[PDB]
Design a protein around this ligand. Sequence first.
Ligand SMILES: O=C(O)c1cc(-c2ccc(F)cc2F)ccc1O
Ligand SMILES: O=C(O)c1cc(-c2ccc(F)cc2F)ccc1O
Lengths: 115, 115, 115, 115
Amino acid sequence: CPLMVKVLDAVRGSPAINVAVHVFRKAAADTWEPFASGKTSESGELHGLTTEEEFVEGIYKVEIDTKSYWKALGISPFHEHAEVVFTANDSGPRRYTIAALLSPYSYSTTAVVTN
Amino acid sequence: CPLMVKVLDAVRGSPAINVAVHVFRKAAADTWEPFASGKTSESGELHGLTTEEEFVEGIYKVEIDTKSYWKALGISPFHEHAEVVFTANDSGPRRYTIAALLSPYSYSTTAVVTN
Amino acid sequence: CPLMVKVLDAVRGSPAINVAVHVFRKAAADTWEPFASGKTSESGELHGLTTEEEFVEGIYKVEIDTKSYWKALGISPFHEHAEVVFTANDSGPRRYTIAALLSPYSYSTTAVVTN
Amino acid sequence: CPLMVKVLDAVRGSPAINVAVHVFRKAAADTWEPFASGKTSESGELHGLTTEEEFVEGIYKVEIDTKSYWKALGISPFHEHAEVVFTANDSGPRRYTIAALLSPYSYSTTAVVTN
Ligand SMILES: O=C(O)c1cc(-c2ccc(F)cc2F)ccc1O
Ligand SMILES: O=C(O)c1cc(-c2ccc(F)cc2F)ccc1O
């Protein structure tokens, strides 16, 4: 699993469950093409987005649908979504964990990249 | 000044100086139109992006050019840039400060909205 | 003002107002002696804690009374307080800003050190 | 495993390996008694600190030795350590993950609490 997304809720101290995630890959025409999508599990994790074969070098955008998450909890948050844009696999295949920690008016994102 | 941007460097414990910032407004055609831009000052702040008259309700994107910042310091970063996407709402007089704290493999962003 | 404290609220997107802050200096007997204290202002800032003459090199602890802050808002928090422990060094003229961003189950702290 | 500690490095985008962690529990005499200690693994995680039987209700302090970690990497960081102080098990037994994300002049900590 070369690309995993993990989302946590800083208000409740819990995984952020059922968060929609959309991944895009930049195409030669300077356009974002849909690449993979899913929702976080009860553990706040989203596995199985892609395979080593399909996850080639490129610029990828991970959009985490934070506004939909907060609204379902009755909170009107500031951001529309969190976007994580990065070059992947430019030095060869790597495994990427994109983690996000969410509050209504703030979020943090970190990448853990392993060989 | 209804919209200000402040950027900090978590590696050096300093304002992030000379960081390029581009602001876009979402247009009816589902496209990002350039709205304002600048570079952060010696205090890490970018003032004067817009006016009360021009900063109407809508969806805005603030792109912070973090990759160039780390490259100028000789540090290998993860993200292409940091993107902050939000709706501006007329809920009474408001000032929006978009703050970002930068590390090579992580960033956090918060909105401070005051009257 | 060589030492300033700034506190933000990541749930409301606002300065954290009326937060008690206590500063201690490490004494030779491996004990924390009270040094300065106050409450954050309407801007979330606490100025005037010390002077250049009194703020000598040493180990300092800044305790931010986060639990009382969340309790006043009716939100159940995790931490008893946030603690920031650091050495102050005479590396030339310096001003220290200790910033903290608060959520019920998470906080971040950064030092901005400027000349 | 009712108490686990996870540490990440925001400069390298990696687990923070070999980070020393000391846990203390507040005793009736208003004193911190040593409770457990260990070092993070190659995955940045520290398991096996305590048992359900020994991890009773109380106020606990988790000290993460961040300064020693950064110095071994040739970085002089701002903080002496990160301290996480919290009441545990006051509503019955819970499982606690204390996560910390480290940069030289900044850190963030979050708790994930599950039943
Ligand atoms: O940038 C973030 O999203 C972030 C993430 C963590 C964190 C990382 C990994 C993990 F397993 C748990 C966490 F809380 C802790 C703090 C933080 O700011
Ligand atoms: O999410 C962020 O960008 C963030 C910002 C701050 C911060 C905000 C405002 C300020 F004047 C100083 C700061 F360190 C402190 C911590 C933090 O995580």
